[model samples]
Target: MGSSDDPRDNFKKAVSAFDPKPLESWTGTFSDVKATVRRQSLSVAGLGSIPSVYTEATVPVSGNTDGSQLVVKVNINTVAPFTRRSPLHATRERWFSCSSSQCSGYSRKCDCQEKHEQFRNKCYSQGGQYSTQSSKCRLGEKCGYCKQEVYLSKLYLVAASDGKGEYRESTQYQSALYSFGHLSQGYEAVPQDKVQVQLYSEGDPFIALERETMGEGEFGV
Candidate 1:
């Protein structure tokens, strides 16, 4: 069967799949955590350097039996301004061929040589000149080439400690680090025992965090 042509039908289907109750339940204090980005060192290629950031927050969690304050530390290593270099090549030459209807002009060859021929014919018909010598196209503005820089980030849980200096470490506690809170581009219920840590990027919410207490018998976010 073919899909519905009506835009309203598609809108209705999309609306039906959305549940607004979860959004309605979002009523609480939302705190913003700031991260500092620092340039570590530049590469030998002069393409810039890997950037890193550190963020910390303090929250209260039910798992803290001694009423100790929960502190979360996040470290993000971002590889940015990645250099992309392109090799230099010779400038393309313009066509000097001519036809009865028209004369060939500056053009680049492609899989469809017939199109170029047709264009050349049209040009000749339109009173274009055909040159006997191969005219080099003046590198058309010297086609400036440059390397592009890309930025990508990797996040990790650096420390999740409390007021008593008790800290959580290892991959076991980090398993749920990346998946906590609203990190996955959607609404999720906050864990009962964990405090949600919100990370901001460029003044917008980017990631969320929670305490890792799955295998450690209840403790840090």
Candidate 2:
């Protein structure tokens, strides 16, 4: 996170990606909703380790006419710890296996050759070009192997009958999902301070409709 005074800081960058479209139709008890933000880090095998920041909005709508509560969780991948430029000439191609002979011709008798062949075949089947000399697959001109850190943001809404119920519980009545993607250098920081939060009142027509739609006979069907 960076101070608001710095335009080039992470805070400004993070806020630039925020869109209010997702919350436009929200209707709920605004007073009962609480928002919190936190950061997390996880390791992904081929992509290496990444860090993410997320905001969660918990709303207790039990007092509303529908007696349902909503939980909205948003996550943004803010940093890519380990990423490199694509070795495949900025194409989608990727490297799956290696061969002997200093990047010369393939060797049929080598046991590793079988695995390399499998990798090539798989790449070809996926519509990617295989480099026989490099033992790599060219996914596309815009694709690369560990090229840029792809920033991913997700929005999830879960509605449950009881306000006290857990999101993982079987009593969930309704849910919605959305996602966004941004590309950046691995070293770029995500502005954790720019996370946004919004709330709506239960009296709003949109909220009433959302609750109804998630009920048994509506979209929940």
Candidate 3:
């Protein structure tokens, strides 16, 4: 994370694909519900690695007699993977498998089992050759003949903790959701008695535009 003096440095380029809007001109029932752009940025992370940036900010709404009338929206887009490391040797006992299903039968090549054992022993004795095993894989006889697949995932969050039980910490309620495409204008009426609201989108709510809040070593691409 960069210092607050210039936090935007922590982000990748801003993507124009998603446009976030604040409802500064809304009226009628929501006349009491104010809106602002708070803060936002783009974030990314590598597969199975920590994120490089996690951006977010809060918007304050005031003068609402009924807390349930509040709503917030976030605009974000998904990017592709950025970092990938080659699979290296492991310990004998940790030798990779190569069954086409597990590995392309690569583990059967030459002295793979012996090489794995050597790599593990050398890694333990030297402690500088590789990272400690967080997860392991079995590459069979086809070890050197294939590649590992990967993908991207972004998470977003929006939460409120009003003193009222409906929004309190114990029974905390959040309207956060995720979407794959840009957000379009749509509105529906929610009956006060039934607590109804429509989510007519394709993405999840908790996913955000960039990777912020998630620490420097926690998310990466």
Candidate 4:
């Protein structure tokens, strides 16, 4: 996702699309978070190894697009102090190769003599961050190249539901930090927490205090 003038716009889309029932809210030194994408008839999974959960839906449409709904799900978790540090950096790439009925996968060589990377290929570096990118195919006259007429459609975790920023500075830092609410295949340290709880969607530090005071322990959750 490109940088939006308003970052909340995407969250709004997610809220409207999923129409969550507002079950509850949660706050604390949380160890995990989970989110589910529900649809009528189509199951949607990440292009590669990024962890996710999905359910199909079958709502009517003006015309038939692909006979699938393609809903997406996400979940994320926190890291333990003594274990190997999680939130480690990683990267993944997806290719849009030629659209030939016979072209089953990325070819060894293209018409332009350029080759494409394998689908769902993964790469990573310690203490690094994850990034996403894409490429496209040429049209006619590019006969030598794959006439697949394909385009790249990549979606990275641009942002997580927990929050964003550097990690492990202070309690406030932890407060500002949010979970990915989804698993990272390459990084098992950050697996889906599979949780059901309440959280403060709208409030301030006082809310955190309320959770701390009224609730028992672990951010009163």
Residue range 105-159, candidate 3, lDDT tens digits:
3445323444444455665574333432313334434222112122111112332
**Against the hidden true structure, what lDDT does model 3 obtain?**
0.26
Candidate 1 deviant stretches above 4 angstroms: 1-3, 32-221
Looking at model 4, residue 18 earns an lDDT score of 40
lDDT of 2 by residue, 105-175 (tens): 43543334445566667766765555665333222111112222221122232322224321121122122
| Residue 187 local lDDT, model 1 | 20
lDDT per residue (tens digit) for residues 1-221 in model 4: 56456433433343334422221211122222233232222111221121122211221122312222211222222211111122222233223344443243445432211332232122222332323233433321122211111111211122112355211222222221133122221222332222121121222221222232342212212
TM-score of each: 0.18, 0.21, 0.21, 0.18
Candidate 1: C-alpha lDDT: 0.28
Candidate 1 positional error at 23, Å:
1.8
- Native-to-model Cα distance after best TM-score fit, residue 96 in candidate 1, in Å: 29
Model 1 worst lDDT run, 10 consecutive residues: 79-88
Give the range of the ten consecutive residues with the poorest summed lDDT in model 3: 79-88
What is the number of backbone collisions in each predicted candidate, taken in the order shown? Answer: 6, 12, 49, 26
The lDDT of each candidate is: 0.28, 0.30, 0.26, 0.25
Tell how far residue 181 is off in model 3, in angstroms.
Answer: 19
Candidate 2: 10-residue stretch with minimal lDDT:
80-89
Local error of candidate 2 at residue 153 (angstroms): 8.4
